[PDB]
A paper describes a structure:
Small Heat Shock Proteins (sHSPs) are ATP-independent chaperones which prevent irreversible protein aggregation by binding to misfolded substrate proteins. Most sHSPs exist as large oligomers which undergo drastic rearrangement or dissociation into dimers upon activation during stress, in order to execute their chaperone function. Aggregation Suppressing Protein A (AgsA), an sHSP from the pathogenic bacterium Salmonella enterica has been reported to form dynamic oligomers. In line with the current understanding of sHSP structure and function, our results show that in vivo, the wild type protein exists in an equilibrium between two oligomeric states: 18-mer and 24-mer.
The core ACD fragment of AgsA:His-DD crystallized as a symmetric dimer in the space group P41212. Mass spectrometry of the crystals revealed that the full length protein (size 17.1 kDa, 150 amino acids) had degraded in the crystallization condition to a fragment with mass 12.7 kDa, which corresponds to residues 35–147. Continuous electron density could be traced for residues 40–132, and the monomer adopts an α-crystallin-like fold, with residues 83–103 forming a long loop which separates two β-sheets. Residues 93–98 of this loop in subunit 1, form part of a β-sheet in subunit 2. In the AgsA:His-DD dimer, this groove is occupied by the dimerization loop of a subunit belonging to a neighbouring dimer. This interaction buries 434 Å2 of surface area and involves five hydrogen bonds and one salt bridge. The hydrophobic cleft is known to be a substrate binding site15 and the binding of the eight residue stretch from the dimerization loop may represent the interaction between a sHSP and its substrate. Unlike all other non-metazoan sHSP dimers which form 3–4 intra-dimer salt bridges, there are no salt bridges between the two subunits of the AgsA ACD dimer. Structural and sequence alignments reveal that in AgsA, the equivalent residues to Arginine and Glutamate are Leu106 and Gly98, respectively. Leu106 of subunit 1 makes no contact with the dimerization loop of subunit 2, whereas Gly98 of subunit 1 participates in the formation of two hydrogen bonds, one each with Tyr44 and Asp45 on the β2 strand of subunit 2.
Numbering used by the authors:
A (entry chain A), B (entry chain A): 40 to 132
The structure:
Amino acid sequence: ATPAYDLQKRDANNYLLTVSVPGWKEEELEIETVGGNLNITGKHTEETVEDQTHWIYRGIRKADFQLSFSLPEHAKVNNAKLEQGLLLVEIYQ
Amino acid sequence: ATPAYDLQKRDANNYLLTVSVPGWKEEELEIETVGGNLNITGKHTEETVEDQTHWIYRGIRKADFQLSFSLPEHAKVNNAKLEQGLLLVEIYQ
């Protein structure tokens, strides 16, 4: 199960990547540009003991992921903002 | 497609409802207690013209929903906090 995402083109030299990451903290998320690819990695935290009695129902699943997007030469990631359970990454030519 | 949720029991007189609502704004969300049921309604905003050329890929779907939970008599909703794409509702006996 990989996060849903959207990819938009704001114009020909710009892209906006939106990744659905509800419940993810900034420290669990990493973005890096390596060998011309943009890698977005979610590594969900060191486990926690969970009393299964306290859990009545668990419909929300959170699993580590890695998304990879080839960047056109010579594209740069300008910012990555985490807001409202969404990771927004602007990619500029 | 209804939002995923979790339901936890913090102890016997307390519950925590967590609803996955990434990208939802506070103005699109409503919680109300009516006839002993807790109703959580998401009504996604007045449409916007969307240039389908700007959309390369749209994996993130956002659809209006309504979740309903019977409250034990005499339970109250203490707060509803929207944070990190999650709606957290504490329900107290």
